[PDB]
């Protein structure tokens, strides 16, 4: 795994092209996330 | 040490997680190639993931971050899709769940859009789709996402396409 930039704890990937995209994020330590919900689903065929 | 508790569809917490799930579906620039073609999900089950050791590991780091950043952990709820969902829920996130080829370096990646994490459920690029039908857009087979608590602290802002 890489390291955060000096003086930082994560990276934010700000979308700079797709106006509808929400942000994405990267952490470099497993300890900075907790997997709180498990969602079981099907994608649904549009009608 | 992980147990899974089913939420009832009647429960407000089921309803609010379903709503984050359904309302953050977007179209993807791959036309549905990685993750399938859909506008919404048939939610079959939502379970809360309970593991004390993993939780405490999380909150310890959270406090270190907070103290390096004027008492601000900068915590978010974000989606994660992974072929390793079963290992993650039982053993926690670690370097084996990192996206080595990710655009911001080898780290662990999360998304505000549930449909973005849906792209990784069967592997990077959606792999070969579902085990049973080899279909990245299977409407029959059951899929799983994680909705996760994430500490960002002082986040390096990267503007990007
Ligand atoms: C091996 C591997 C690689 C990547 C992911 C993954 C999972 C995600 O949910 C994700 C969200 C936004 C951007 C990238 C993402 O990548 C999961 C597992
Ligand atoms: Zn299938």
Q: What is the CATH number of the domain that holds B103?
A: 3.90.228.10
Q: Tokens 């089913």 belong to which residue?
A: B6
- Torsion angle of C-alpha atoms B16, B20, B22, B26, degrees rounded to 10: 170
Task: Provide the resolution (angstroms).
Answer: 2.0
How far apart are the CA of A7 and the nearest CA of chain B, in angstroms?
8
Half-sphere exposure (Cβ direction) of A14: Cα atoms closer than 13 Å: 6
In the annotated binding site of B, the residues are: 130, 133, 138, 141
Question: Could you give the CA distance from residue B159 to residue A13 in angstroms, rounded to a whole number?
Answer: 6
Please report, in angstroms and rounded to a whole number, the separation of the first and last CA atoms in chain A: 43
Q: Does B43 contact A34 at a Cβ distance shorter than 8 Å?
A: no
Distances (CA, A) of B34 to A35, A42, B66, B87, B93: 23, 15, 36, 22, 23
Q: Is there an atom of ligand 1 within 6 Å of B116 CB?
A: yes
Q: Tokens 């799930």 belong to which residue?
A: B21
Q: Helix or strand or coil: residue B113?
A: coil
Q: Does B38 contact A41 at a Cβ distance shorter than 8 Å?
A: no
Q: Residue ranges of the domains in chain A?
A: 1-47
Question: Could you give the CA distance from residue B111 to residue B97 in angstroms, rounded to a whole number?
Answer: 15
Please report, in angstroms and rounded to a whole number, the separation of the first and last CA atoms in chain B: 40
Question: Could you give the CA distance from residue B153 to residue B5 in angstroms, rounded to a whole number?
Answer: 30
Q: Taking CB atoms and an 8 Å cutoff, what residues of chain B touch A7?
A: 154
Question: Could you give the CA distance from residue B62 to residue B69 in angstroms, rounded to a whole number?
Answer: 11
CATH code: domain A1-47 is 6.20.320.10
Question: Could you give the CA distance from residue B158 to residue B161 in angstroms, rounded to a whole number?
Answer: 10
Residue A41, beta-bridge partner list: B43, B143
Question: Could you give the CA distance from residue B132 to residue B86 in angstroms, rounded to a whole number?
Answer: 18
Q: With left for phi above 0 and alpha for psi between -120 and 50, is residue A45 left, alpha or beta?
A: beta
Asked whether the CA dihedral B144, B24, B111, B4 is positive or negative, the reply is negative
The count of domains in chain B is: 1
Q: Does A25 contact B60 at a Cβ distance shorter than 8 Å?
A: no
């Amino acid at each position: 795994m890489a390291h955060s930039p000096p003086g930082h704890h994560s990276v934010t990937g700000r979308p700079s092209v797709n106006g509808l995209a929400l942000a994405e994020y990267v952490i470099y330590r497993g300890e900075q996330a907790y997997p709180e919900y498990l969602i079981t689903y099907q994608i649904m065929r549009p009608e | 040490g992980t147990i899974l508790i089913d939420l009832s569809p009647d429960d407000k917490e089921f309803q609010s997680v379903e709503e984050e799930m359904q309302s953050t579906v977007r179209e993807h620039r791959d036309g549905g190639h990685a993750g399938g073609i859909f506008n919404r999900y048939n939610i079959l089950k939502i379970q809360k993931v309970c593991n004390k050791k993993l939780w405490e590991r999380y909150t310890h780091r959270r406090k270190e971050v907070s103290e390096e950043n004027h008492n601000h952990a900068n915590e978010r709820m974000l989606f994660h899709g992974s072929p390793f969902v079963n290992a993650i829920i039982h053993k926690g996130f670690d370097e084996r769940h990192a996206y080595i080829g990710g655009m911001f370096g080898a780290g662990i990646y999360f998304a505000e859009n549930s449909s973005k994490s849906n792209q990784y459920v069967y592997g990077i690029g959606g792999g070969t789709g579902c085990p049973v039908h080899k279909d990245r857009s299977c409407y029959i087979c059951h899929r799983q996402l994680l909705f996760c608590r994430v500490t960002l602290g002082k986040s390096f802002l990267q503007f990007s396409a």
